[PDB]
Design a protein around this ligand. Structure first.
Ligand SMILES: [Mg+2]
Lengths: 206, 186
RNA sequence: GGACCUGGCGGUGCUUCAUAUCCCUCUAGAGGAGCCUGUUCUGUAAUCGAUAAACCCCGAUCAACCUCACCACCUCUUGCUCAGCCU
RNA sequence: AUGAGGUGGCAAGAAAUGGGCUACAUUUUCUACCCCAGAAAAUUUAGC
């Protein structure tokens, strides 16, 4: 690494600094004073104090990226968001008066809820002890399941069975399916929760 | 037959022959007749063997199967009676040395000496067509180096698709001569 | 023989924790296709051989009637330089 | 003669395994541009 150990990661949170000194606790006052002495790394290209910034969508875009072509990944992400928005508007214009109150048109809300609906809380850990592999249930950390939902969504959208259907169109369809607890990603979560319930007797190996 | 990575061609030909032996015929014929591009071949032989392959494609891991609209099994030993006639007609003809590098189909390399074209043109009748090997022999090169222009002088654009499957970069500089219409009336 | 001192125990097991190497975790390949190839076996009297040393004539590419190695026949010699030898 | 030459001959096949070279596309390809356009169509090896 080209940064010395003294260098610390920057804090881009804009409203953190505007906090009144009166609200600051003694510990928070101390750490604010301490950061004065520390050296701070240059903020990386990426996160910004923008009010429209979304770390989850940024991570999804980075996970779609191939060969460092970030422009194309962000283009695909924004196209997916626009497609979801337009599909929801089309479904809203054609809905009954009482059905328009339960139709979400915010693409960010749909994206977050669809990813949350696919998060597995339990997983397996291959462990060979007696000469034969043994899959044991283990509770998944929050970061692990957040990553797994994204990875499953992207892998499902990268299947070759979808011939000539462009990535934004496939991803919008999968997101809207997972928003309603439907589709193959929700089934992949269910088949993991079931295959980890089928081996609850193997937890004693942990 | 367009196969997938798990497809075994000689194996499937073997069961296709077992079927016809069980039915009972003298020396059933079913072997690869054309190597066109990766995982795509043309099998040739008795219609029973081809029907067996078509109906057992799933077991043989064949993604697609399409019977050719041709009279019979070309490029196989079944065409042996057609060897002796052609040879005689070629005997009278004096074949000169090709001016350009003409590639063969029997073994997919340039014709070297004119006295061997006479028998290679007859072996081509009863031998598989080594088209993929010919495409490699003509277009194989290191990454980054330029490719020559390619012109398909004749009807159709099938060779264009085959080249696309074989070499994308060589296909980038491919063009076809229009034999159905002309832009300008000369 | 009584009492006591130092121990060593090349010590043996458990208990607690440091518990990093190495697994699991992440990314991309490799299983397909066509070529050339290393090795091994068998073959011939012989070697299947090696191209800072052939051929090429888009890219590459095989023997080339090449050439050094090898088999079978032979020949030159006091010769190149009190020579010569990729032992 | 372990030196120098002449003549001819020497062409090889099988698998089992290891490696290398090519194309392998929809997040693609062609043109204009250099990013607001138009058309086409399981084992196992490394790394951080
Ligand atoms: Mg030899």
């Amino acid at each position: 690494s080209r940064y010395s150990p003294e260098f610390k990661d920057p804090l881009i949170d804009k409203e953190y600094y505007r906090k009144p000194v009166e609200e600051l606790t003694e510990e928070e006052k101390y750490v604010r004073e301490l950061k004065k002495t520390q050296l701070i790394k240059a903020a990386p290209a990426g996160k910004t104090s923008s009010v429209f910034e979304d770390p989850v969508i940024s991570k999804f875009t980075n996970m779609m990226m191939i060969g460092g072509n970030k422009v194309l990944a962000r283009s695909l992400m924004i196209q997916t968001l626009e497609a979801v928005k337009r599909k929801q508007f089309e479904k809203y214009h054609a809905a009954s008066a009482e059905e328009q109150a339960t139709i979400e048109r915010n693409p960010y809300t749909i994206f977050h809820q669809a990813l949350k609906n696919c998060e597995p809380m339990i997983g397996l850990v291959p462990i060979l002890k007696g000469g034969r592999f043994y899959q044991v249930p283990v509770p998944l950390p929050d970061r692990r399941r957040r990553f797994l939902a994204m990875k499953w969504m992207i892998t499902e959208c990268r299947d070759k069975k979808h011939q000539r259907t462009l990535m934004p169109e496939k991803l919008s369809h999968k997101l809207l399916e997972a928003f309603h607890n439907q589709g193959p990603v929700i089934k992949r979560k269910h088949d993991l929760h079931k295959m980890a319930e089928a081996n609850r007797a193997l937890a004693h190996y942990r | 037959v367009l196969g997938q990575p798990q497809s075994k061609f000689n194996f499937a030909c073997l069961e296709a022959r077992e079927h016809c032996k069980s039915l009972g015929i003298e020396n059933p014929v079913c072997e690869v007749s054309n190597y066109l591009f990766p995982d795509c071949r043309v099998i040739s032989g008795h219609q029973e063997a081809l029907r067996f392959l078509q109906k057992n494609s799933s077991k043989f891991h064949f993604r697609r199967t399409r019977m050719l609209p041709v009279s019979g099994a070309f490029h196989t030993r079944l065409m042996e009676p057609a060897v002796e006639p052609l040879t005689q007609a070629l005997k009278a003809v004096d074949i000169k040395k090709p001016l350009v590098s003409v590639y063969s189909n029997v073994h997919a390399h340039r014709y070297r000496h004119p006295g061997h074209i006479h028998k290679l043109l007859a072996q081509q009748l009863v031998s598989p067509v080594k088209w993929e090997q010919t495409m490699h022999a003509i277009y194989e090169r290191k990454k980054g180096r330029g490719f020559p222009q390619t012109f398909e002088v004749g009807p159709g654009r099938q060779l264009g698709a085959i080249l696309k499957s074989c070499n994308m970069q060589a296909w980038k500089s491919y063009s076809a001569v229009d034999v159905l219409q002309t832009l300008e009336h000369v």
